[PDB]
Amino acid sequence: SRDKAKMRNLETQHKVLELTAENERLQKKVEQLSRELSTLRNLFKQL
Amino acid sequence: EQNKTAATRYRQKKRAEQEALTGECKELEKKNEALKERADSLAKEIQYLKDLIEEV
Ligand SMILES: [Fe+3]
Ligand SMILES: [Fe+3]
Ligand SMILES: [Fe+3]
């Protein structure tokens, strides 16, 4: 029973690490897409 | 007794620890889903504008 809980614990730590990696990936992409979109809007904001 | 208490306190602590970890994981999981939304959304927006331009 102790082991089961220990694996359950090891697995969640592993997961937090993955999400923290993906989370970091997503932030950069979102920051990237924001700049791209900002430029497109600035194009139309001419008239 | 004094041995049953030590066993209980242990569990109560050990329990609150998994909950915190599971919780941290779950919140990180919700933040990540939110990001995937911003990403898709921004991408749709970007494609819309690009299309608008090409249509001319
Ligand atoms: Fe694992
Ligand atoms: Fe610009
Ligand atoms: Fe739109």
Swiss-Prot record, chain A:
Annotated tissue distribution: Abundantly expressed in myoblasts. Enriched in brown adipose tissue (BAT) versus white adipose tissue (WAT). Expressed in hepatocytes (at protein level). Expressed in T lymphocytes. The expression in granulosa cells of antral follicles is induced by luteinizing hormone. Expressed in chondrocytes and osteoblasts (at protein level).
Factors inducing expression: Up-regulated by cold exposure.
Cell compartment(s), UniProt: Nucleus; Cytoplasm
Function noted in UniProt: Important transcription factor regulating the expression of genes involved in immune and inflammatory responses. Also plays a significant role in adipogenesis, as well as in the gluconeogenic pathway, liver regeneration, and hematopoiesis. The consensus recognition site is 5'-T[TG]NNGNAA[TG]-3'. Its functional capacity is governed by protein interactions and post-translational protein modifications. During early embryogenesis, plays essential and redundant roles with CEBPA.
Cross-link type Glycyl lysine isopeptide (Lys-Gly) (interchain with G-Cter in SUMO2), residue numbers: 45
Name of the protein in its database record: CCAAT/enhancer-binding protein beta
Source organism phylogeny: Eukaryota, Metazoa, Chordata, Craniata, Vertebrata
Domain bZIP stretches: 1-47
From Swiss-Prot, chain B:
Parts forming coiled coils: 1-55
Summary of subunit composition and partner proteins: Binds DNA as a homodimer and as a heterodimer. Heterodimer; heterodimerizes with CEBPB. Heterodimer; heterodimerizes with DDIT3/CHOP. Interacts with CEP290 (via an N-terminal region). Interacts with NEK6, DAPK2 (isoform 2) and ZIPK/DAPK3. Interacts (via its leucine zipper domain) with GABBR1 and GABBR2 (via their C-termini). Forms a heterodimer with TXLNG in osteoblasts. Interacts (via its DNA binding domain) with FOXO1 (C-terminal half); the interaction occurs in osteoblasts and regulates glucose homeostasis through suppression of beta-cell proliferation and a decrease in insulin production.
UniProt family annotation: Belongs to the bZIP family.
Modified residues (N6-acetyllysine): 26
Region (Leucine-zipper): 21-49
Name of this protein: Cyclic AMP-dependent transcription factor ATF-4
Superkingdom of the organism of origin: Eukaryota
Sequence segments annotated as region (Interaction with GABBR1): 20-56
Function in brief: Transcription factor that binds the cAMP response element (CRE) (consensus: 5'-GTGACGT[AC][AG]-3') and displays two biological functions, as regulator of metabolic and redox processes under normal cellular conditions, and as master transcription factor during integrated stress response (ISR). Binds to asymmetric CRE's as a heterodimer and to palindromic CRE's as a homodimer. Core effector of the ISR, which is required for adaptation to various stress such as endoplasmic reticulum (ER) stress, amino acid starvation, mitochondrial stress or oxidative stress.
Domain topic, free-text comment: The BetaTrCP degron motif promotes binding to BTRC when phosphorylated.
Gene giving rise to this polypeptide: ATF4
Domain spans labelled bZIP: 1-56
Subcellular location: Nucleus; Nucleus speckle; Cytoplasm; Cell membrane
Annotated segments matching region Basic motif: 1-15
Induction and repression of expression: Regulated at the translational level in response to various stress such as endoplasmic reticulum stress, amino acid starvation or oxidative stress. In the absence of stress, ribosomes re-initiate translation at an inhibitory open reading frame (uORF) upstream of the ATF4 transcript, which precludes AFT4 translation. In response to stress and subsequent EIF2S1/eIF-2-alpha phosphorylation, ribosomes bypass the inhibitory uORF and re-initiate translation at the AFT4 coding sequence.
Modification after translation: Ubiquitinated by SCF(BTRC) in response to mTORC1 signal, followed by proteasomal degradation and leading to down-regulate expression of SIRT4. Interaction with EP300/p300 inhibits ubiquitination by SCF(BTRC). Phosphorylation is promoted by mTORC1. Phosphorylated by NEK6.
